[PDB]
């Protein structure tokens, strides 16, 4: 079993249940940028907890960058408050975490070629294109990028226990190859 993963990113979606005039948000908030040619949302930011919000005209927003579930929820609530202050009748509704990313560093290098050869059905490896082995796991639906340095990053999770289970499942395989 051994060491535990450290979460690095959490993505949450929350519906404010009201239409927003994006340019009015951009012109009033210092911490907002709007470029309709590049992207259809205003990119707001706050410094506690450090997070970014893609707030769309339809009332949905995507809050990213948090390191914990409580931080993500609190940041989403703060963004809803900020939209409320600008005059819109935004209401915090429909919160749901939709991605968690983790990272871990087991203390030994990995023989990626042998791992790819043995577990070819569940992995892909093109070292000319990307220096990391890609591993897709069916039971917890987690995708792991495995690197020769002994560092693994897990993605696609919707709960912390999913990345924990994925690391527990993958650790014996990495032990076998050095």
């Amino acid at each position: 079993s051994g060491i535990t993963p450290t979460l690095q990113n959490i993505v949450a979606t929350v519906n404010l249940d009201c239409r927003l005039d994006l340019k009015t948000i951009a012109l009033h908030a210092r911490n907002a940028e709007y470029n309709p040619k590049r992207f259809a949302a205003v990119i707001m930011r706050i410094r506690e907890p450090k997070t970014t919000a893609l707030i769309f005209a339809s009332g949905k927003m995507v809050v990213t960058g948090a390191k914990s579930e409580d931080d993500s929820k609190l940041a989403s609530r703060k963004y809803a408050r900020i939209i409320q202050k600008l005059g819109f009748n935004a209401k915090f509704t429909d919160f749901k975490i939709q991605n968690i990313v983790g990272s871990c560093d087991i203390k030994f290098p990995i023989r990626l070629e042998g791992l790819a050869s043995k577990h070819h059905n569940f992995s892909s490896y093109e070292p000319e294109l990307f220096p990391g082995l890609i591993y897709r796991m069916i039971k917890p639906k987690i995708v792991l990028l495995i690197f020769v340095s002994g560092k693994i990053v897990l993605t696609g999770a919707k709960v912390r226990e999913e990345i924990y289970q994925a690391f527990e499942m993958i650790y014996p395989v990495l032990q076998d190859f050095r």
Partner: protein, 537 residues
């Protein structure tokens, strides 16, 4: 290239703040030695006011102020919203013509520069050579009235705000308010009447912050022009929005001294409204309560306010400190860090009042709540302030009698000893504390779930260890103050902890023993803990 070209560029490209400070000092001395060439420096420093960088604009404004300060004084006689001769006449006109520019940086620089120019040279403004003295004085009045009018129009149209932090910031409003404060020092009282009428007492508040706090000694006791501002502030305090509440609280705090001196009568209503607004548990995300408590601490620091508060509890104890200041206890565990820090600082200010009022609310309740704060805190500053408040409270309570401290905290000592000497687990297998040990601010049994559960993976092990050592320091101090015969439960608790199956509890027990030894009057008192430690090593 001359020296001036390289000297001005330091204000933008300076490696450190001291280098830019030295640059502006050198430039001011240059103008002093060569008074004939102010315009050469001004034409090179002014273009920085519209630069995008914040620090460059601030430094350029300071440089303009210090350059202008050395020139002689002038005396030639003997609704579109804002979103994202007089020697300096063309400079001021260039600042005012882009004071309504769309870009907010230009407005920020224009306001700063106008403030800096008028701060030193407002008296001589607007006059023209060849005109008589009295007519030039009238022209100066017209100029200052025009500047105040334009600045107030800017204040009532700008809506640019920054929401990066909890406390929203309006840069253009703050700079324009400081510009009004600079302007209003030189005008006659008739223009002050005009400006007070223009900024009518309704709820602007940031405008009020500098429409008063200037010509202060003459506005005091000046009838309506000082009676209406207190009504406006009191209305703002009771308003719904957190923003206006925070702004009003920050506007009254620097003026609290003279607003207190204005009347003894107004103190009753003011403190009533402040305590009433603080009694209502504000919204979770509001930083306004910090400003409200800073206002409360400042108001209670003056002697006459203390006299008024003592007088207020005439027919009953409802308005006394003992019944009121527990209204601050709920905010100890507020989500925003500023509110928690404000609660602790206000409680420390109240504790250091003296005057025989502190003995009322000082009891085991606040001590246990502060110990819970020590255990469950994660922020360094709030933890430090909590431990400081704990030390001050214990010292004040031991000033009356050590027996009072010993038997006031006796009801709470054992659960807090359980919390202090609690173990720490591993990342995925926590060892949670019992929630029944924590009291509510207004309840017998219990936002801080992660620290209580002991989840090392979600809250780092450093935070848990730091909470343990802080609790050890607090409990060692409170052991040291209380008399020796009452320490039976304390000493047996730590002695049993020293033999626990856990590793963390033994560490905490040793820490508590060490802090108790350190805080004692002499080291010989704690000698009963000698042989268990020698058995440990």
């Amino acid at each position: 290239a001359t020296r001036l070209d390289r000297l001005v560029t330091i204000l933008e490209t300076g490696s450190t703040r001291l280098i830019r400070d030295t640059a502006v000092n050198q430039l001011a001395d240059w103008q002093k030695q060569h008074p004939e060439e102010l315009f050469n420096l001004l034409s090179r420093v002014v273009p920085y006011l519209r630069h995008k960088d914040w620090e460059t604009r601030t430094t350029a404004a300071k440089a303009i102020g210090k350059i202008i300060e050395n020139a002689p004084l002038y005396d030639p006689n003997a609704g579109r919203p804002l979103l994202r001769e007089w020697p300096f006449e063309r400079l001021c006109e260039f600042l005012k013509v882009d004071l309504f520019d769309p870009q907010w940086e230009t407005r920020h620089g224009a306001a700063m520069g106008l403030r800096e120019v008028i701060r030193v040279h407002g008296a001589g403004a607007g006059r023209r050579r060849g005109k008589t003295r009295k007519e030039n004085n009238d022209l100066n009045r017209q100029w200052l009235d025009d500047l105040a009018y334009r600045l107030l129009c800017v204040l009532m149209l700008d809506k640019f705000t920054d929401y990066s932090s909890d406390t929203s910031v309006a840069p253009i409003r703050e700079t324009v308010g400081q510009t009004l404060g600079a302007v209003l020092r030189h005008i006659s009282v008739e223009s002050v009447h005009a400006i007070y009428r223009l900024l009518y007492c309704m709820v602007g508040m940031v405008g009020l912050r500098y429409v008063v706090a200037v010509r202060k000694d003459l506005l005091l006791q000046d009838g309506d022009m000082i009676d209406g501002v207190v009504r406006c502030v009191m209305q703002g305090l009771g308003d719904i929005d957190d923003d206006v509440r925070s702004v009003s609280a920050a506007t009254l705090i620097p003026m609290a001294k003279e607003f207190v001196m204005m009347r003894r009568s107004a103190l009753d209503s003011l403190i009533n409204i402040v305590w009433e607004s603080l009694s209502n548990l504000g919204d979770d995300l509001s930083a306004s309560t910090g400003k409200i408590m800073d206002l409360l601490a400042t108001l209670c620091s003056f002697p006459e306010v203390l006299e008024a508060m003592k007088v207020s509890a005439s027919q009953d104890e409802e308005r006394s400190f003992t019944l009121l200041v527990p209204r601050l206890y709920p905010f100890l565990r507020h989500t925003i860090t500023s509110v928690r820090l404000a609660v602790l600082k206000a409680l420390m200010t109240f504790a250091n009042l003296g005057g025989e009022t502190s003995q009322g609310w000082l009891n085991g309740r606040i001590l246990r709540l502060i110990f819970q704060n020590i255990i469950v805190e994660r922020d360094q500053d709030t933890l430090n302030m909590s431990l400081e408040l704990w030390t001050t409270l214990v010292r004040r309570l031991a000033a009356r009698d050590p027996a009072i401290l010993a038997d006031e905290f006796e009801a709470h000592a054992e659960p807090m000893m359980q919390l202090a000497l609690h173990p720490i687990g591993v990342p995925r297998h926590p060892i949670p504390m019992n929630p029944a040990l924590f009291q509510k601010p207004s309840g017998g049994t219990y936002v801080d779930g992660h620290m209580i559960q002991g989840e090392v993976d979600l809250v780092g092990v450093d935070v848990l260890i730091r909470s343990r050592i802080s609790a050890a320091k607090a409990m060692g101090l409170i052991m040291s103050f209380i008399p020796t015969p009452r320490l039976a439960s304390y000493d047996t608790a730590v002695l049993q902890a020293l033999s626990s199956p856990y590793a963390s509890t033994q560490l905490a027990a040793a820490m508590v023993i060490d802090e108790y030894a350190k805080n004692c009057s002499t080291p010989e008192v704690a000698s009963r803990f000698i042989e268990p430690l020698q058995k440990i090593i």
